[PDB]
Amino acid sequence: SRAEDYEVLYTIGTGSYGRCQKIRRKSDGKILVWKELDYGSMTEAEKQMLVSEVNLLRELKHPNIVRYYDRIIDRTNTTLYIVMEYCEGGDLASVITKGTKERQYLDEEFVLRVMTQLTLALKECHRLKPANVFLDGKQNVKLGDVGTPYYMSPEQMNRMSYNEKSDIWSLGCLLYELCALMPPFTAFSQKELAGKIREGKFRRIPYRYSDELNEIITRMLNLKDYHRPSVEEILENPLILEHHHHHH
Numbered sequence: 001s002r003a004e005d006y007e008v009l010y011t012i013g014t015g016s017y018g019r020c021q022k023i024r025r026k027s028d029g030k031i032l033v034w035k036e037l038d039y040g041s042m043t044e045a046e047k048q049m050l051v052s053e054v055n056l057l058r059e060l061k062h063p064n065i066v067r068y069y070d071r072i073i074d075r076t077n078t079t080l081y082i083v084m085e086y087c088e089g090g091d092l093a094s095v096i097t098k099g100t101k102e103r104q105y106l107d108e109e110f111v112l113r114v115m116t117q118l119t120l121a122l123k124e125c126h127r128l129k130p131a132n133v134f135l136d137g138k139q140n141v142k143l144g145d146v147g148t149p150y151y152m153s154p155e156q157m158n159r160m161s162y163n164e165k166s167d168i169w170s171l172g173c174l175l176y177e178l179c180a181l182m183p184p185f186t187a188f189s190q191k192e193l194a195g196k197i198r199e200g201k202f203r204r205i206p207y208r209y210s211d212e213l214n215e216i217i218t219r220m221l222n223l224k225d226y227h228r229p230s231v232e233e234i235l236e237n238p239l240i241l242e243h244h245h246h247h248h
């Protein structure tokens, strides 16, 4: 309830809108994080949109989505603290960086676990970048939360639509990058990037990965959203087994 009930261990990152801090609850020593949002220049209405959003997020309870726990208002002042689950495994961006540095591609089994658990998280969301996807202590996957929009789908750069299938395209880019350690479409300019995305061509993921995994990732990257598989069709794939799901 009160910021004074927690000790800040350290800053994890200073992403958009403020900081991400690893904190500890004094009462029982529970490790959490909170996000710092400067309500400073908001409106009596802007604050209302924020409150609606925070209520919505308080609604969600899914093992593959970072869990909301509490909100805290400061009086010294102008700061809203959104208290959330801490994911001890870090983010996928760091996994990819490590694979690069070690010259070591990621296990297919790990990619299949990310595919399964992120697809389930999206399914729940339906009633995305590596730095927004976290791992817990068992390498379970948790969806959380100027730059090149590497994952922008074709229809959304033609302003056509933003639907479930656009999410599927983004998941395709993420899994592709997990496999290749590079996004499917790269470019120095955003116009060049747009051309590459529109063309829809990319290299096969490395040959150490199964044809079946390549096939599903490629299908998610289809130029036509109606040729991309739904979450249900993804989860029906024979590649996806019990042990790829979350386990406490």
Ligand SMILES: */C=C\c1nc(Nc2ccc(S(N)(=O)=O)cc2)nc2nc[nH]c12
Residues within 6 Å of the ligand: 012, 013, 020, 021, 033, 066, 084, 085, 086, 087, 088, 089, 090, 091, 094, 134, 144
């Ligand atoms: C602000 C992000 C955040 N981070 C975590 N866990 C976490 C992230 C990054 C590392 S790292 N780069 O040092 O290996 C370790 C742990 N958990 C969060 N839950 C909500 N927001 C979170």
Ligand SMILES: [Cl-]
Residues within 6 Å of the ligand: 100, 103, 104, 105
């Ligand atoms: Cl490599």
Ligand SMILES: [Cl-]
Residues within 6 Å of the ligand: 203, 204, 205, 206, 207
């Ligand atoms: Cl290749």
Ligand code: NA
Residues within 6 Å of the ligand: 088, 089, 090
């Ligand atoms: Na770590």
